[PDB]
């Protein structure tokens, strides 16, 4: 069992995450 | 069992995620 | 069993996701 | 069992995460 | 069982995390 | 069982974390 | 008497599961 | 009497699970 | 009498689980 | 009588679990 | 009588767990 | 009578656990 | 004698007699 | 004798008699 | 004799008799 | 004789009789 | 004789009789 | 004879009779 994983990133990455703002 | 995974990214990536704003 | 997965991206990617805004 | 994991990043990465702002 | 993990970063990384601001 | 872990960082890293600001 | 009112009343159990991601580039 | 009112009343159990991420670049 | 009121009343159990991350670059 | 009021009343048990991180660069 | 009031009243048990980190560079 | 009031009243048990760190560079 | 009188009710009025 | 009189109720009024 | 009189209620009024 | 009289209530009023 | 009289209540008023 | 009279209450008033 030979397994290879490769991940190469050369690009700018901008991520925004918002969770919430719920009124109960 | 020989398995190869390759992921190459050269492009700018912008992601926005919003979860919420629910009134109960 | 020889398995190869390749994913190459050279293009700008913009993604917006909104989940919510439900009134109960 | 031979397993290889490689992760190479050459791109600027900006991440913002906000969790909260819930009124009970 | 031969396992190799490699993680190489050459890019500036800025991360902001905010958790809270909940009114009870 | 031969296990190798390598982590090499050559990039500036700025991290900000805020937890709190909850009113009870 | 001028009333501008927005009102919500919930009496039922609510379950919500959300998954966002799992994209390979 | 001028009333501008926003009111929410919840009496039901609420469960929420959110997962964001798991992206490979 | 001019009332500007924002009111929230919760009487129900609430469970919330959030996971953000697990990205490989 | 001019009232500007923001009021919140909670009578229910609340559980919250948050995980942020686990990113490999 | 001009009232500007922000009021919060909590009568319920609250549990909170937060984890931030575990990033490999 | 002009009242500017910020008031908080808590009657419930509160548990909080926070972990920040565990990053390898 | 049970009686409930409500005017301009936007909230929740719950009355239980057992 | 049980009686509930409410005017302009935007909140929650709960009355229980056992 | 049980009686509840409420005016302009935006909060929560709970009355329990056992 | 149980009686509750409330005016302009934005908070929480709890009355329990056992 | 139990009586509760409240005006402009923004806090929490708790009355328990046993 | 139990009586509670409150005006402009922003705090917590607790009265217990046993």
Numbering used by the authors:
A (entry chain K), B (entry chain N), C (entry chain Q), D (entry chain H), E (entry chain E), F (entry chain B): 14 to 37
G (entry chain P), H (entry chain M), I (entry chain J), J (entry chain G), K (entry chain D), L (entry chain A): 13 to 37
M (entry chain R), N (entry chain O), O (entry chain L), P (entry chain I), Q (entry chain F), R (entry chain C): 14 to 31
List sentences quoted exactly from the publication behind this structure:
Islet amyloid polypeptide (IAPP, or amylin) is a 37-residue peptide hormone that is cosecreted with insulin and one of the most amyloid-prone sequences known. Overproduction and aggregation of IAPP leads to amyloid deposition in the islets of Langerhans, a pathological hallmark of type-2 diabetes. Although the precise link between IAPP aggregation and disease remains uncertain, IAPP aggregates have been shown to be toxic in cell-based assays, and genetic and animal studies implicate islet amyloid in the progressive loss of pancreatic β-cell function. Over 40 different proteins, with diverse native structures or in many cases intrinsic disorder, form amyloid associated with human disease, yet all amyloid fibrils share a common cross-β architecture consisting of a continuous intermolecular β-sheet supported by networks of zipper and ladder-like interactions. Amyloid fibrils have a similar cross-β architecture, but fibrils formed by a single protein sequence can have diverse structures, varying with time, self-assembly conditions, and sequence modifications.
